[PDB]
Every structure is written in structure tokens, then in C-alpha cells.
Assembly symmetry: T
Homo-oligomer: 149 residues x 12
Amino acid sequence: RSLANAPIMILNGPNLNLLGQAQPEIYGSDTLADVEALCVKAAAAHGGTVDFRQSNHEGELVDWIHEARLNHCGIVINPAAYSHTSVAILDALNTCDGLPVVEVHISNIHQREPFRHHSYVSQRADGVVAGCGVQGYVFGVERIAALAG
Amino acid sequence: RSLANAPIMILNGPNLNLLGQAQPEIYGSDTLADVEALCVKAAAAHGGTVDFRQSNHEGELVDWIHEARLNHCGIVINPAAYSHTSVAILDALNTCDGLPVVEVHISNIHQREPFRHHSYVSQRADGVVAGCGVQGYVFGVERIAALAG
Amino acid sequence: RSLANAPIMILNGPNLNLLGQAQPEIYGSDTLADVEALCVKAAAAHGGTVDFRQSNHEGELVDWIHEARLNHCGIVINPAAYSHTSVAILDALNTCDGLPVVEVHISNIHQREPFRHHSYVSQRADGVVAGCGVQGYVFGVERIAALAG
Amino acid sequence: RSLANAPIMILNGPNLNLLGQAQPEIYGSDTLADVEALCVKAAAAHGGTVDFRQSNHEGELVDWIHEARLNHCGIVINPAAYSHTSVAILDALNTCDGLPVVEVHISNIHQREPFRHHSYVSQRADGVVAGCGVQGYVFGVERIAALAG
Amino acid sequence: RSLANAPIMILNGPNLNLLGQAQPEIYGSDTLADVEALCVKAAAAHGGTVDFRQSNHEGELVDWIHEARLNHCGIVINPAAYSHTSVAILDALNTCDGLPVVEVHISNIHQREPFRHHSYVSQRADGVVAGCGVQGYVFGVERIAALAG
Amino acid sequence: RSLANAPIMILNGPNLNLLGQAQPEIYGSDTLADVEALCVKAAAAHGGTVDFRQSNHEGELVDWIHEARLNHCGIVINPAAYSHTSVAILDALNTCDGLPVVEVHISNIHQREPFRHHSYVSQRADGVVAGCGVQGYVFGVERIAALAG
Amino acid sequence: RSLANAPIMILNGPNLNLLGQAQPEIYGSDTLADVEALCVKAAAAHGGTVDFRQSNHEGELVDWIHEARLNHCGIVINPAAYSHTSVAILDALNTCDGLPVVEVHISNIHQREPFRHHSYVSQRADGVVAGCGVQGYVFGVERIAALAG
Amino acid sequence: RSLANAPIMILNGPNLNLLGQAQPEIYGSDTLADVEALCVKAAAAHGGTVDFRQSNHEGELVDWIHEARLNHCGIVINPAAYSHTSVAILDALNTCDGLPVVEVHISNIHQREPFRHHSYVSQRADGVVAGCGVQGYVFGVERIAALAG
Amino acid sequence: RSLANAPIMILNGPNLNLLGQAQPEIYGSDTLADVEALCVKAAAAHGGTVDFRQSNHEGELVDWIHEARLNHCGIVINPAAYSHTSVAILDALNTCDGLPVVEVHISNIHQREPFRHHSYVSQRADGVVAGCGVQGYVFGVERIAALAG
Amino acid sequence: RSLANAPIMILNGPNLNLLGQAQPEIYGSDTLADVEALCVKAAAAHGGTVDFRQSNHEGELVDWIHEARLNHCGIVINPAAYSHTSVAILDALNTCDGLPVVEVHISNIHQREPFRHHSYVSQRADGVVAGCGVQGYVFGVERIAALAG
Amino acid sequence: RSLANAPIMILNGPNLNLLGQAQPEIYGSDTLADVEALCVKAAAAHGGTVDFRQSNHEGELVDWIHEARLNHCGIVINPAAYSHTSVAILDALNTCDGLPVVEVHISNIHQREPFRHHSYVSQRADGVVAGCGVQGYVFGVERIAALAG
Amino acid sequence: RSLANAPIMILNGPNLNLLGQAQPEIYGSDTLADVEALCVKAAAAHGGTVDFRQSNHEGELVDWIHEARLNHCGIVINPAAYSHTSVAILDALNTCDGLPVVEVHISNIHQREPFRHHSYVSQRADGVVAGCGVQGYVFGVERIAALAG
Ligand SMILES: O=C(O)[C@@H]1C=C(O)[C@@H](O)[C@H](O)C1
Ligand SMILES: O=C(O)[C@@H]1C=C(O)[C@@H](O)[C@H](O)C1
Ligand SMILES: O=C(O)[C@@H]1C=C(O)[C@@H](O)[C@H](O)C1
Ligand SMILES: O=C(O)[C@@H]1C=C(O)[C@@H](O)[C@H](O)C1
Ligand SMILES: O=C(O)[C@@H]1C=C(O)[C@@H](O)[C@H](O)C1
Ligand SMILES: O=C(O)[C@@H]1C=C(O)[C@@H](O)[C@H](O)C1
Ligand SMILES: O=C(O)[C@@H]1C=C(O)[C@@H](O)[C@H](O)C1
Ligand SMILES: O=C(O)[C@@H]1C=C(O)[C@@H](O)[C@H](O)C1
Ligand SMILES: O=C(O)[C@@H]1C=C(O)[C@@H](O)[C@H](O)C1
Ligand SMILES: O=C(O)[C@@H]1C=C(O)[C@@H](O)[C@H](O)C1
Ligand SMILES: O=C(O)[C@@H]1C=C(O)[C@@H](O)[C@H](O)C1
Ligand SMILES: O=C(O)[C@@H]1C=C(O)[C@@H](O)[C@H](O)C1
């Protein structure tokens, strides 16, 4: 599916509802709403749209991936903590044959504790952006636009 | 309990809703409904019944195992990705003193990525079947039948 | 906040709803209701109160930490199996800048299987109590009463 | 080849000659002869026959695997200790392009010492059954019947 | 024995003679004499008494555990660096069939360097308290009073 | 430093001279010259310029990083193989106090051999982009323009 | 059980046929026949006898263990290289419910390459003697004499 | 010894009897008889002769190594699966003080599964040839011919 | 020195003063006094004598090794827990050029927890006896008698 | 390319300029000039020629590999210490689609320190020769001639 | 404290009493009295004095470190075996806020056995000298002189 | 060679050209020219001279080591990053039979990141100084004076 025919799904993992309010020295002062506005504006320059959601539940993220599999033109995901722990989210992305996927981490996870250096999502994601702040979501939208188109 | 007095609980973990539709070269073309039918038939030959369920949610699965503990004669479980990650599911099964438990994986997890090699559920499960396709749920039900006697 | 102005949050993870009914040789014969009343009594001696809650869902536990972050004077948490697996809960606790946190394990996890030896919550909790039975929750309450003062 | 045209090879590794006589609390009280009768009955239901053998010698199992490659419709194997140590049996199975293979462990190896958790044979076997008692051989035979048709 | 018939032994390992004077940002500004008074006060509320000691010698701590084995109603020990290195102290504790033992760490060792994550003593202690400051000794004494009854 | 005042240094590691001519199924069919023209246009859209270079020599890349430290407004680097092996290139980037740095890998290294999973450069780079093909370079340029702004 | 009723089985692993002729600086200059005479005289001092055997074949050693299980009063075994690799010989000795077993190594394996530091036989052997030369076989016969009486 | 006075022992391990017939994409379509004729021809060009043998049995291989020790001018060995597992064949080779030994693998073991990467025989062999197909056997003969001379 | 000219030093590590009194299911019911009487009798049969000591202090053990280096004909040591942790005791035995040394463990350490499998002493000991009960000391005496001759 | 159309590139890594002068007990007394002569002679027997070079610089070896890719019929390489550390030389050889490549080590690396046991080059090289001395270079030339022919 | 006002504590761990007498091929033929004279001399050239001590006992070492903390200008320590095992001695040094500490090893521990590779003291010592013979004590003293300055 | 007949080679690895200008809080504010003057002065007191160089290039350092091998009295080397990565420079130094080598690290590498803990150079260097600042190079010069004397 192309960007003209279906939205880009933009998924956000656990604790991201507090972006811009908690640990600003690590994740910045922009909020999740500010990030949704960036995404909308980047997709509109390519003639696309976005479906932007956040959840703290692993299984709800699994369900939204299944939805995107049939209805969306690609997926930009910041799995947050679940990057490091969820084989179930990996597996949900693996049922999405050929759908473009870009993983995004606001912080540079390779500079932080060793438990954050590995992500299960990365083994499926076509592209992985880390430590580019909320600008990384925009890079994700632009990479989907290049892959879908 | 016996098979005549209570149903066998058949539990299915994340992504199993898309069985037969996704990655058929790994997991085959039979659907979850097809699997449910195989189970009903095998339990019937032993004078028993099944209670077949699927969920994406780790905590829902926990809840269902608590229910089984009191109302079912045994559990046949395919924990899917949660086999590799859920200490919480293992611990739910450990509350079920003496209840027969059979773990089933459709694919042969020992030929796949190393993160798939280990299951938490397997330390509590009485029996473990892997790589026997959807026929391994039939083996599951048969083994519950033998043990519930 | 202070103990006079807001309740202490007391959070229990998965399977702890069965406390006193299952595996009494490991976890004792006192119920979760029994624990709650111990907590209510200990907080009352310091002029405080408690908000006592259990869940089998990782994401609901995250949401209740976020609620504590704004409305409670500290957290006493028994993550149960999530202690071992949940980076998400650790991250939720991390968003709570300066809020006193005390982790509690009923059993001595250090004498159990090696997968129980490490907890994600312990890198954030101020204090960790293990193997002091349900009396560890009273210790927890007593320590938050000291830290809040 | 088919079950009607050639027998199913049933191979048993070292120490299995003492089945039913030794360590009954781990492996049961049914003998190797009892297992052979279970196998003969299971295959006859599908119009097939079995060739059941046991050896303490690694090279003799490799020789038998080579024979089956030419004359048998599939192989049901309990390699016993050899599971954990024999790259030479794994390799013999690897020469049998397309022959159905099912590996059987009477006990649940995943609940035992860590040196028993890994099996060389499992990387080639199509299916792997563990902890289903001697009933696991019957599973084996039924799985070959499905694959050889 | 019982708290009315024998004292609780309170043992302190190496460098705790400088408590209050060195590294106050990690271990606080209360002294070992201050901790002794808190212990004395807690035990007297249960009609008990304490026998409070410190040593920088591994062999001396071993000899004091032998003494406790015969003359004391239980042991509250803060092994200090010996927690991480001393199989001999673990083994002395192991000779004390059934005597209640609570291990205390002033600091939350789980947040410090990885060599401080493991403790030998923890596999024998009944209970372990970490990161609750000098108040953990009062928790120790309370636990021993509950067990000794 | 501003984009107006000095060029962005774009550094490419060993073997990138052959880009578009070798292993096109992993690294694409665009040439290194093609990447250089993408970079010049990306920087131009922010009023900036680029200094694009490639080398098979680890010490030469070290020397170019020192040069950048004094004369450039940031560094986009694709270390190629040296990402995995060069402590010396990490240390050269460590000399560059506060200079924006973005590391780019054409291919998604996290899907490839395990020796490619770790990069010494990622511990210093502000941002890391992998698996976005040659478009990653454009992202790299954009992030430097936003960090230099 | 008694030395009077049945001989002590003395089993020697692979390459022990060459003892005294190969690598004398590691294993000495006494031959295997010289060891057999030592073992005859040691057993004679207790009123017993020996049945002394050597094989390069893992399976043959398994079959002699099963023989011993029924007809001998204990086993002294030097598994030679099979100590480090044979799960099969371990398993054969585990079928020997209560039979006294002593493992002997001529050389001190703990001083040699790391692959020699672990023995599978040592988890079943009641006693293990290493680096006492051919005199270790006399020790083994004395230990069996003490265990049988 | 010399090539004019004694034959070169050429030994082949388990499954090599099927060379040319099984997994031809890995090991080639030349048979073990074709290999023997290559070896005869190479040895004759140096005035020498070969003694070519194959076996699936580890113990037999050990026995043949013992024969060579006394009767042959060197050993070219393809230990096949027993390269990875047999400490016993290593130790047989170690009894052969000074005898030239060359280990040959038809496939390039270093490109295959990690369990194939280590050979116990490589620590004693003088030279090791891998991935040169059946010509590697000719290289082994030529090397034995330079070392005997 | 010889057995006629100097005694055999027999050193016992921490907690062995309680032998016969604590953990009799693991270490037996004979006391340290009974073990010294065994040693005296065994030494006397070879015309030697013994100097039998025990300490809980690692440094004292070091001092007594030093003393043996000058005044005794060999050392039999049971290092007890310091087996596992004392590089200092290893190093004291390394200063003893050529002095016979035999290490003895009453229990079969290879069947106990993984922290007990490694001994620093065994890389220096000429011989190592484990799991032969108190009889292990007599085998120690006998080995020093053969080595000092 | 055929051997008649283009030379075989023979590449030598760091420190091989001193071959025959340093550590002769490890690498022999033939020089690098001696080695080139051997190669010229072996190539000439197959109607071919060689291009023999040596370099201490990783980048220069990468550049020469690039040259060979276009102008040579195959490569024989002794990467010397770069075997163990150069991902960059491995990737240079990966750009050479279908070019025959044989890695040569003069010493038997597998007998040396464990850092020398793994080579990055070996995952790409078609054939690997180790411990055949400078004769291994002739084997390399011979293999190239067979693969180009 | 300055060198003029207080002596430099020179500390020596276990077995060092035998320096010059034992293992001279590793540690040399100079004695501990020789090393003290070298320290006195080097301190004298800076107007300083030394307090040179040796002990086999870990806790004595800790006690002397506490004395230095209050009465000495700095510590030069050779912890000997306790380097590898003593967290207690590292924690003693860590109580000495800002006191200059230099760790010395006579032998180059990095060329020896792997258990010697790691030092606990090294994480706190300001400088670490290894393999420079007894001259490394002189280096110690000189460094203390520069840092107390 | 003596210090009177030949200069001491002082080699400095990558990034050292910015000593004193970069990361002064780790490496100090003295420049490389200041270090060379300290070495010239130390050598002059022994009647010797220095030959002080720096390079970013691994192979140029190998070349310089080859020079020193024939023309210099010894080598003082700060390999810098290449300490951790270069088996090539290790090997270069291994060609220098009997030449005194001292390795120096300005900063205390044991307190930094774990990839800095190991040095390949340290397995050949006679002595190793770390964390003594730039005064460590004077220690180096002094140690070569003693060894060449
Ligand atoms: O950088 C991110 O956005 C990530 C967000 C989190 O919540 C962490 O758990 C991840 O580790 C990193
Ligand atoms: O084979 C199965 O049924 C399993 C199904 C999945 O969903 C995976 O997550 C498991 O790894 C395996
Ligand atoms: O002791 C406790 O309360 C913990 C309770 C749980 O449920 C386990 O999962 C933890 O491992 C231990
Ligand atoms: O359970 C089985 O049948 C196996 C039987 C054996 O003998 C063991 O060695 C295996 O580990 C397990
Ligand atoms: O926190 C405590 O009381 C401990 C005190 C010590 O001295 C350290 O050795 C331990 O690691 C921690
Ligand atoms: O993907 C890239 O651009 C990098 C390209 C290289 O050359 C490889 O060496 C790296 O592993 C990946
Ligand atoms: O010491 C012995 O008797 C042993 C003899 C062998 O043959 C070795 O394989 C063992 O490793 C040790
Ligand atoms: O390459 C060969 O000749 C080898 C052949 C065998 O049979 C294997 O088991 C080895 O792993 C490789
Ligand atoms: O078996 C013995 O004598 C040993 C005695 C001890 O005290 C233990 O610490 C050892 O682990 C074993
Ligand atoms: O054997 C040789 O040719 C190799 C040559 C080198 O220089 C070493 O670095 C390698 O490790 C071995
Ligand atoms: O080199 C030194 O001075 C050391 C001396 C000791 O006694 C050893 O224990 C150390 O490992 C090293
Ligand atoms: O401390 C030194 O001088 C070292 C200097 C370097 O450049 C680092 O790379 C080394 O890790 C440390």
C-alpha cells in the first residue's frame, strides 16, 4: 500500500505518555503531542497521513501491529522499554510480510546501561534510528515514504 | 479432576490469532479454528471436552491459568513468544499443584534463533512437544487424557 | 508529599492474588487481605494511610506508578515475577524523581533459581527487603515513613 | 517412501536396555519390550510396520541411520545420552535428505541438569517430544505416519 | 533458644568501625555506637537483649558465629566486604541448624558495582535487607524476634 | 559552530570506494559519488556545505577527525568495518569536545553477523542511523544542521 | 555387596593399553599389567578379588558397567578421555543404585588444559582420586573395601 | 619412519563412507574410492604407499592410530564429526611421539555452525587443511612426505 | 626431608573444628580428634609422625605452610572453604619448592554447588582426594609417604 | 580469469618482512624471498605467474585486494596478525564476487594462544591452510590453479 | 599531609616475607629488607620517611590502612595474593578520602595465569605499577612524592 | 645494546598528538613536547639519549618497532587505543628477542570502561605502568636504564 492510500502507523511504547514531563535531561522537553504534530507535517509533504498512538500494554501494541498489517502503509515504532524485552512485538512485526518498518529511540541507547543495548525489534525493522531526539520520528516518516513510494 | 467432569483448557499466546494467514512456511496453513477442531475431536474420543482460548496479553493468560486451577482437568498451552519471556506465566502454572500441563510449539524452536531455545514454561510443563505442527496439540490433549487418569 | 497529606501506594504484581492459597510452603498462609491490614496498621502508627492494590498486568502496574508519581507519598512494591522481566516497571519508577520506593520479596529470591536472582526494580528502589515474609511489607511501610519525614 | 512400502525405524540409544529396571522414578516401569509393542500397535493402525532397535554404541547407531536412509520410511529416535554429545549422529541424520525424523525423550530434559538441556539431534529432527513418558514413542510413530503420507 | 533466654548476636564485618566517619554520602552519618543503641532499644521492646560486635578478621567472625550457634537466639549480620568473598562465613552460618539469621546491607548493593551484586551469605540467611540505612538493623532485630518466637 | 561558517565533514571508511559496484544486494546500486551529490544537496537546503572523503586507512580517518575538530561544524561518519574494531577512531571523536557527530551504516547491522552488532563509535556519536540505505547520510546531514543551529 | 561374594570391577578407558609406553613423563613407567597386579594384591589384603578390564570403546564400557551392576561388589574406574566427554558412562553408573563407585585419574587433571578439568563421572562417583599416580588405583580398591563393609 | 619403509596411514571418520552420495553441495561428488586413488597417486610420486581406511566407530579409530604409531610413517586424518567431540582420538594422537600428523576437512568448517569451529585434533596435528575439497588429502600426503623426509 | 626425619604437617581450614558435630549427613560423625588418630596410626606404619592443626584464619594457614616448608616432609591439607577463595594459600604452597602436597576434601565437591567445583589449591597439590570421607586423610598420609621416599 | 591470462596475487601481512630472521623456532628459517621463489615455481608448472607482495598496513592490504578483484586470477593470503583483528580485510575479500581465495598460516594457530584461534578472513576464504610451514603457500597456489581451472 | 610532616606507609601482603628466598625466577633475589632500604632511600631524596610493613593477614592489612588514613601521607601497597581476592582491602582504601595510593606488583601479572589478571585494589589506586621488579616500589615512592606535593 | 651506545625508542600511539589540548581532566595539561623533555632529562642522567616519536598509524608503529629491534637499546611505548586492539604491534614487539620494553598508560585504564582493561602489548612488555600521569614515561626510561644496564 502507498502513502496516498493509507496512513503511516506511529506506535509509542510504555512511559512515553510522560514525554516532555519526565527525565527531560535524557528525553527532551517536547511532548508526545509535539511529536505527533511533527509526524503529521512530515507525512503531509509526501501526500500522506499518520495514525499516532501510545500504549503501556504489550498486547495492545501487538493488536495495533496486526491492524497495521492490513490497513496501513508502514510502521514507525518507538517500543520504549519493550524494545529490550518483547519477543511478542518482534513476532507481531514478523507477521507483516514486506510492510516497511522503522524503529526509533529518542535517546542513544548504546550510551546507556548494557541492558538497553539490544532490541528485539531491530532484527525485523528495515531501519533503526537512535539518539536523534524527537527528530528521529521525522526521519522514520521519511524512510517509510521512500520505501512505500 | 477427571476428563468426564471438567474440560481441558487449551491456551494460545500472542500472534496465534493469525495462524494460517502469516508465515505459512514456518507455521503451516491450518488456522486456529482448524486447531480448535482437532482438539475437540481428540478430547471427544476420551469422553472429554475442551475450553479453547487465545490472547495477546500476558496478564489475561495468567488469569486464565488461575481459572483452570480450579475448574479444569489440565492445560495444553502454546505460550508463543511468552514462552521465552514470561516468568509470570511460569509462576501462574506453579500455583496449580499437580494439575497436568503440556506445552506445545508448532515450529521446532531448537532449529531457530537462539533466543527461541529456552522456554520458562518448560520447567513446569509435564511434557513438551515441538515441531510436530498443529498435530502437536493433538498429542497434548492425548497426554492430558493419560495423565488425568 | 508527607504521610499526613497523601497515602503510601502499596503495589503487588502477578499471582499475588493467590497469596495464602498457593505454595504456602514458599510464601506462607497469610492472605493478601491479611497483608493489607498489617500495612494499614503500620501506616496508622505514623499518622498515615495506604492505598493497596494488586494486578497481573504489567501495563496497569505502570499506570498506577504514574498515578503515585503525582498523588502518593511513596511506593512499597512487590513486583513478583515482573521484578525479573520488566524494564517497563523500572522505567515507570524512574519517572518518579525523588519519590521514596521500597521493593519487597516475601521469599528469599537469592536461595531460589538463578533467574530469580536479578531484579530490574532493585536498581531504582531505595531499599530492598527479601525473605522476611509478609512482615517485609511492614518494614517497607516503616522505611517510607522515615524517608518521607 | 510410504508406510505401506517400508518400516519405520525406531532407534534407542545407550542404557535404554535397562528401561523399566533402572531409575523408575525418572523413566517409568514399562520396559523396552513394552515400548516396542506400543510402537507396533500404533503403526499397524496406519497400515505400517516398525523395525525397533537399541544400542550402547555411537557408531552402530550411525550405521543404522545409514541403513534407514535407503530402506525405511522415517526414523523415531531416543538418542539417550548421545543426544547431548553426538555430532556424529546429527551428521548421520543430515545425510538422509527429506526423511522424516522425530526425536523422543522419555523424561522432561528441560527440568533436569543443564548439560541435558541441549541436544544435537534436535537441530535436524523435524519434531521433538520430551517428558511424555513412553507415550512419546507413540506420538513419534503418529507423526512419521502423517509426514510419510 | 528464645529472646528471653539469650541475646541476639549482632555481627559487623570489616571497615564498619569507621561508620559515620567515612564515605557518609554512601553510608550515612550515624556511627556504629548509634547503631548499637538502636539495636538495644528494639530488642528491649520484645524483652530481649543484644550482643553487638565488629571485626575486620574473617576467622574472628567465623569464631563468633560458632559461639552464637550455642549461646544466642539468632544472628543479625552485616558482613560488609566479606558478603562478596567469604565462603568461610557462609559455611560457619551453615553449621547453625535452624538458628534464625538476617543479613543487612546499609547501602543498596544492587545499584553499585557488579562485584557487590552477589553475596555468599544470602544463600543461607533467612532474610536479607539492603539499602534501608541503619534502620535495616532494627528490621533485622524485629525479624529475629518474630522468628525466635 | 555554524553551517554558514564551515563545512560538514562526511567521512567514509574502508571498502566504501566500491559502493554500488560490490554486494549490491546488501548495500544498493548507488555509488559513493552519488552519495556525495545527495549530501551536497542536503546541506545546501540548510545553507551549508560538505567536505566528503573516504579512506581505507584507520590512521588517516583519525587525522581527518582531528582536522574536523578545528575546522568543521560537525561530522557524519560511516566507519564501515572500523566501526567494529577501532578504539582509535572512538578516541579521536572523544577529542572533539561538543562537536556534533552522527554515525551512519547503510545496512541494518543488527540483522547481520553478531560481530557487526557492536560499534565503538556509537558510544560517542550523538545519533546513530542504520539500515536506511544511502538516505541515512541525508538524515545524518539533517541532524548536524539541527544540532549546529 | 561383600568383597567375599563378588569381585571389584576395575575399568580402564581409551588409550590406557599404552600406559608405561607412552607419555611417561605425564603418566609414569608402570604398565597396565603392573597396575592390574597392584590391584590384585590390594583387594587380596581385604579378602577380595578384582576383574580388571580396558577398552577404547565407549559402548563396551557401558556394557561392562551394566554387568557390574548385577555381578560385582563395586567399581573403580579410570575413564581416561571419556571422563570429559561421556554422558553415556555417567548414565550407566546412575543405573547402579547404591553400588560403590570410585573414579581414578593417574595425572592431576586440575593442572592440565581446561578441557580436562571437568568429569561427567565425578557427579556420580562416591569418591574421586586424581594425581596420585598408579597408587590411586590402590586407594580406589581400599575405598570400595571400606564402603562394601 | 620413512616413506620408502612404511605406508602413510590415511584415516576417515564417521559418515565419510557416504562421500559423493550425500550432501554433494557441501562435500562434493567424488567418492571415498576416488579419494583413495588420489592418495595412492600422490604417495607414489614420492616413492611411498598408503593404507586407507574408514570407520564410524571412535574406538576403532583410536585402535588404528595405535597401529600407525608402530607401523606407518605418518597419519593424514579426516576425523569428521569426531574432530569436534573426541578427546579420545586427540589422546591417541598424543601417544605418537614425533609422528607427523595432518588433519584434513573437506569443507571449510570456519564458515559453518559454531559447534564445528573447534577441533580437539587440531591441537596435536602438525598441519590442518580445511576447505580445499578432496585435494586437501593430496596436500596432506605431500606434507607427510616433506616431514618424513 | 624424609618421614623418619620430620613430621607430615596436616592442615585443616575453617569450620573443621566442628567436624562430627555439624552437618553429619554431609561430613560424617567422626570428629577432628578421630581424624588425627587415623593419621597418627597411618604415619606410624611408615615410621613417620604427624603435626595436626586446624584454624579458621587464612593468614595463620599461610604461616603454618611457611613453617612446613622448612621443618616438615610434606603437607596434607583440607583447606575447607579457603580451597575456593584463597589465592594466598595457593601462593604459600607455591613457595615450597618440591615439597609433597596432597589436598583432601571429605565431601565430593563435584556433586555440590558450582562455587565448590573449583579449588585454587589443586593447581599446586601433587594429588587431590575428594569424597572419600575421613579415609581421604589416610590416603593423603600414604601418598606423602610414597613421595617422600 | 585463467592462470594463463592473469597472475595469482600473493599477499602477506605485518611482520612477515622478518620471516626467516625472527622467531625461527615458530616460523622457520626460510625467508620471504624463498617463499616467493616457491610460489613462482609452483605457478609456472600450471602455466601461471604470481604477483607477490608484503605490507604492515591494513589499508594497503585492502587496496591490493581491490586491485586483485579486477586484475588477478585468485588470491593467496597470509594475513598475519590482521587475521585476528581485521574486519576490513574480510570485507575487502567479500567485494570479490567468486574470486578464489585461500588463507595460509605458517604456524598452527590452533596450538597457540586463544586470541590466535579465530580468523575473520576464514569466513570468506574458500580454503584455509595452517601449520604446513612455507609449503602451505605452495598448497595455496595449487588450490588456486584447481579453482581457476 | 606532606612528606615532611608524615611518613609514607609501605604495605606488603602475604608470602612477601619470603621474597628473595622463594621462586626467584619470578620475583628476583632481592629480599624484603632490600626493598625497604630502596624505599627509605627514595623517600629521603624528597625529604620524607617511610613506615614499612608486611602481613599475611587480611584484617591486619585493613587495620594498618585505617591507621594510615589518619597518620600517613600516602600508601604504597603490594597486596600480593590479596590483590585478586580482597574486596575488604579495596573498601579500607576507599575510606581514605583523597589519600594518594600506588599499587605495586613485582611480576607482570598480565603475563601470568588469568586469575592474576584482575586486581580489586586497582580500582582505587591512583597509579598501578607491574613487572618492574622491586624497582616498582621506588616508582611508587616517587609517585606518592609527586602527589602529596 | 647499552644506553651509552644507542638511544631509547619512545613510541606514542594515536591521538597523543593532542596531549594537553584534549580531555585534560583525564590526561592532564602537559603536552607531548613536555613529555619528550621529561624523557630527554631522565635519559641524560643515565648517560643516554631518546628517540621520541608519535603516530596515528598502526603499521607505521610496527615499522618503528622493527627499527628499534636493530638500532635502539629498548622501547618505552604508550600504544594508546592500539593497546586494546593491535595484535600486529604485539607481534612486532615479539620479534625483538631480549629487547627491554616498558608499556605506559597515562590514565589508570583499570578504572575506565571495560574495553580498556585489557592490553595486547602487556603480554610482551617487561613492565607496565598505568595511572602515573606523564611521570610514568620517566618511570619507563628509568626501567630501561636498569634493564639495559
Ligand atoms: O530512547 C527511547 O526513546 C527509549 C525509551 C525508553 O522508555 C527506554 O525504555 C528505552 O530504553 C529507550
Ligand atoms: O512454534 C511456535 O508455536 C511458536 C510460536 C511463536 O509465536 C514463537 O513466538 C515461538 O517462538 C514459537
Ligand atoms: O518472593 C516473592 O514475593 C516473589 C514472588 C513472585 O511471585 C516470584 O515471581 C518472585 O520471584 C518472588
Ligand atoms: O529422557 C530420555 O529418554 C533420556 C534418557 C537418557 O538416558 C538420558 O541420557 C537423557 O538425557 C534423557
Ligand atoms: O552496604 C553495606 O553495609 C556494605 C558495606 C560494605 O563495607 C561493602 O563492603 C558492601 O559492599 C556493602
Ligand atoms: O552498513 C554499512 O554501511 C557498513 C558497511 C560496512 O562496510 C560494513 O563493514 C559494516 O559492517 C556496515
Ligand atoms: O590422568 C588420567 O589417567 C587420565 C588419562 C587420560 O587418558 C586422559 O584423557 C585424562 O584426561 C586423564
Ligand atoms: O569437512 C569435513 O570433511 C567435515 C566432515 C564431517 O563429517 C563434519 O562433521 C565436519 O564438521 C566437517
Ligand atoms: O568436603 C570438605 O572437607 C569441604 C569442607 C568445607 O568446609 C567446605 O567448605 C568445602 O567446600 C568442602
Ligand atoms: O602462522 C602465521 O603465519 C601467522 C603469522 C602471524 O604473524 C601471526 O600473527 C599469526 O597469528 C600466525
Ligand atoms: O607480582 C607480585 O608482586 C605478586 C606477588 C604475589 O604474591 C602474587 O600473589 C601476585 O599475583 C603477584
Ligand atoms: O591512558 C592512556 O595513556 C591511554 C591513552 C589512550 O589514548 C587510550 O586510548 C588508552 O585507553 C589509554
